[model samples]
Target chain A: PAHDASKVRASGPGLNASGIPASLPVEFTIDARDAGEGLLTVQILDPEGKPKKANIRDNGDGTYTVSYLPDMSGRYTITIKYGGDEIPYSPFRIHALPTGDASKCLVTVSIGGHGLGACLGPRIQIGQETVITVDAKAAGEGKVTCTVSTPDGAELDVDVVENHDGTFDIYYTAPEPGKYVITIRFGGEHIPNSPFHVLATE
Target chain B: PLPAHDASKVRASGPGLNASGIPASLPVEFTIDARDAGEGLLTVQILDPEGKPKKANIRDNGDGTYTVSYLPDMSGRYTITIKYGGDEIPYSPFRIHALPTGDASKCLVTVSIGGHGLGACLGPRIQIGQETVITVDAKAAGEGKVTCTVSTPDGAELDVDVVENHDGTFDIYYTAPEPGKYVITIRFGGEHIPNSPFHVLATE
Candidate 1:
């Protein structure tokens, strides 16, 4: 058997999950069943591009489990080496959610008369009042914040109302037509569907 | 408040940005953490093979983490981009390759509300204006494309698409504009995936 980089395969939920929590240990499996690996090595770069401690465990069955811990809440890069060659999909990237993980937060958007839903973001008329609701019951702990940017990347004003039930209501109006990017965050992270691309018509 | 001037502080990573042999019709999801990047707006987009701009589910964890999702429509070299403020994060444009393949028989459709499944099928009392997300895993199913169609109570038909991930898995999202019985038909390679024609009575 010849050592082939393409023959090596890495698979696991931790490989590219956006839900990975910060300051946690993450692991993924590397299968070299027949890749004919030489010395298998794993390197992990944290959000700051700094190398962190990585562990490689051999299952004794042609499979190896690679693990690392990320203390920052940003991107992490992973490189796998087999037979002195970088395996396929080497230098994999992963995002670590903040301790809060606002990704679990459910958001509902509605507008004038005809109510709007989070189906695919809401479409509304320019200068129209749009209301977006957020359910943070299970989204972790964080202060809710809102930022609305017009089509040209300018920040707009928004009024946020807390429902006192781990939920919040955000009210805003698009000053101009175009695609508006509405960013709603919990604590400092964007809630589910944050930066929604809402198209407002004249 | 001053916005975060350090775009470098924004970190974008996840397998969604770097992978090969991803199946079309499968949703690809990644994460962008902007915490401590000061204060800044995050924007994301995907470019298909033809170079047309695509829309994705951009979610902010309210704590500076973001989960961006999109399904590849065709196979080729696709670009995944993440931006903070006005600059691209680390590895701004991610290169991904997806192939067209999957089996309709091996795919399963499951409807869940906040991670809780009603049962093997959809629940009876679906709410209007609330999103009902259905997931299909085609990893076992080989060689096909996944798609969906919805028929409102008014007899109006709506075509739907999946938000594919890198591992041949995808998500189907729907929000009933009005109250009525909705028929959701899921398919792979022109054939119905397992548990097709799911019927749900949506209420106001």
Candidate 2:
């Protein structure tokens, strides 16, 4: 008979669905004493499905702690695995709060296969597949969409994908040089810091 | 003398700047370290801009945390006073701003006793039979007129000398009668100021 996995419980970072502040250490812990030989492994994914590096600490007392500092505001998914098997509550969702004078778009950029990196006005190579992610919880729920504008006031067709959590993502290919503006709206209202600027290089 | 307070262990929410873009009437919640603030009876008083005490519902939560709720009918500045051990907390008398709702007029009024202005919900205390001078400062008055009335604790009307400063301000004086609570109501353009029905206490 399979072990009673129901006894395995997890805590921290707001439980199943929670809201956390940005630039704060979000920690999670799991108790799988009922599951024999529970070797725990955890994976944290940002809104863009990119894995975030986290530190795991084992207490050797049937409990493990995983700590990660969320730099951006958005939704994050924490998946836990035990002994190479996904736990009953494998995935937990959390909304990261935004930081600043006001809640704004903290868009993160990913280039090529180098994984996602912070969008600090980085120069992206032309024709490179770029992914943009944002925490839209502050903007609120409803029809969340994005419009990409080139330096010359031209709008580009962009698809805004909403994660089940409180985050959204967009995929765009660097077009011409100058600066590209990404405007995101929630429920027809512009976010506090909308019109994010990104530089495109040849 | 300044009260001993541990600002490091004080955490408060609501009742301030409207961080969540919510109304000021929303209940304010806070938690204080009992060890640092001393274990005594915790009391919270909310005062309107007119130096009148406003009623508030407070809960201890029993976990070193407390909550205070006040539904302000009018909008303007408010004062929050938290007291323990018979003294003001270090962070007592905090000023809170509540946003005005609807098309309410924006008239400001203030009430004071013996020149000591009360800012929180706790009303000022005056000795019975003593000539108590009450002052009212009105700014941005609607229709450029301010009217005031004083009611004794026994619900009897008292005569007051209302002096207009000729610059959108007024002062009133009345002799403290009977040891009890006094009610002072101020109005502008036929509407109560942000916190009307000011409360004052007369002690023997």
Candidate 3:
């Protein structure tokens, strides 16, 4: 409630999940970027939106330092407050690795359909459920149907359902851990948007 | 005032039934009257207040016979009823009312996307920036169309298009650009009680 009484700035340590090695300790630095003599309070939040451990120390230079330990490796955010105004630090994502082991896996799921015309495409990932909507206006017509096939040839039945707007939705879901082939059929005809795939898991 | 009219018999059909044997839940409309009753247009609507076939379509048609198009959700007998309005009741003709066999209500939390249970069902995870198609099935005993809307975890709403299938099902399609959680709601036409909800974990 005074002229810039005491301003505080805080930062959390960098968190990384390095598999194999005994996990590295994240180093977070909090500075009284512009604080007076009053003690400053700093808090760190992990990716899961949970508070972590923090320590406060006197910089002896009219500034205070607050250090925080990284609890887990992931996207974290640091929040700083002063004069009733809160400033949230930029959010960052951290990836944990096995240090040296290198057997990487890549996966990509591509989705497409005929009902929506040849302009729009359906792209997705593993363990993910996507919707392929068939809008009469969007797809240039109302009666449309489409089907999705897994790398192993398992297909999710596709049917056109009535829409509140008097349109239809031709939907399908891909199979697990394999390449997929999706076909779009419009008004009893195949529109030829095919060979969609589901890459390996990341 | 004396009204000039004659006995006018009319017939109507209920909405088409679904896989569950329940009628499409839509009111049946038809033209009634052989002799001009001077009444411009006549309206008819049948409802199963007791939810019995006998009570179906009993709300409309002064003297016409009708039937319940769909079967009830559960195997049970429901009443067939009707209600109609014109210039006057006496002007209406002498018609027969018949309750025909069929279908099913109750605001329910239906599953639109994701697995059947909690935690990643290892089934299908709705991803961020990934377009997915999901379906939700619900049935209620009231009059109204159920609407499904999906929202993101950061409070962002995902653009989801829904298709009402012929089998009493709804198909929803949309993509989550930002990875997080999502929710789906089923709104009853001015009367959706306890909208259905679900979560989507978009892995970045």
lDDT of 3 by residue, A81-140 (tens): 544445344233444222211112111222431111122222345654545553344333
The candidate maximizing TM-score is 1
TM-scores of all predicted structures: 0.33, 0.27, 0.24
Docking class of 2: incorrect
True contacts kept of each: 0.00, 0.00, 0.00
Clash pairs of candidate 2? B46-B121, B47-B120, B47-B121
lDDT of 1 by residue, B33-112 (tens): 88868677788877767676666689978887889887665567788777788788877787888665656788866665
Clashes of each: 34, 3, 60
lDDT per residue (tens digit) for residues B48-154 in model 3: 23332221222234544333332222122233322233433332222223222221134433332332211111112454554545444445433344444556576
Give me the runs in candidate 2 sitting further than 4 Å from their true place: A1-5, A14-18, A99-202, B1-204
lDDT of 2 by residue, A1-74 (tens): 24444566888874437477655456777887787774677888876566776788887887777787554567
Runs off by more than 4 Å, candidate 1: A1-99, A120-122, B1-183, B186-189, B192-201
| Model 2 Cα shift for residue A13 (angstroms) | 3.2
Model 3 misses residue B39 by how many Å? 6.1
Candidate 3's chain A scores what TM-score? 0.33
Cα miss at A139, model 3 (Å)?
Answer: 47
Ranking by lDDT: 1, 2, 3
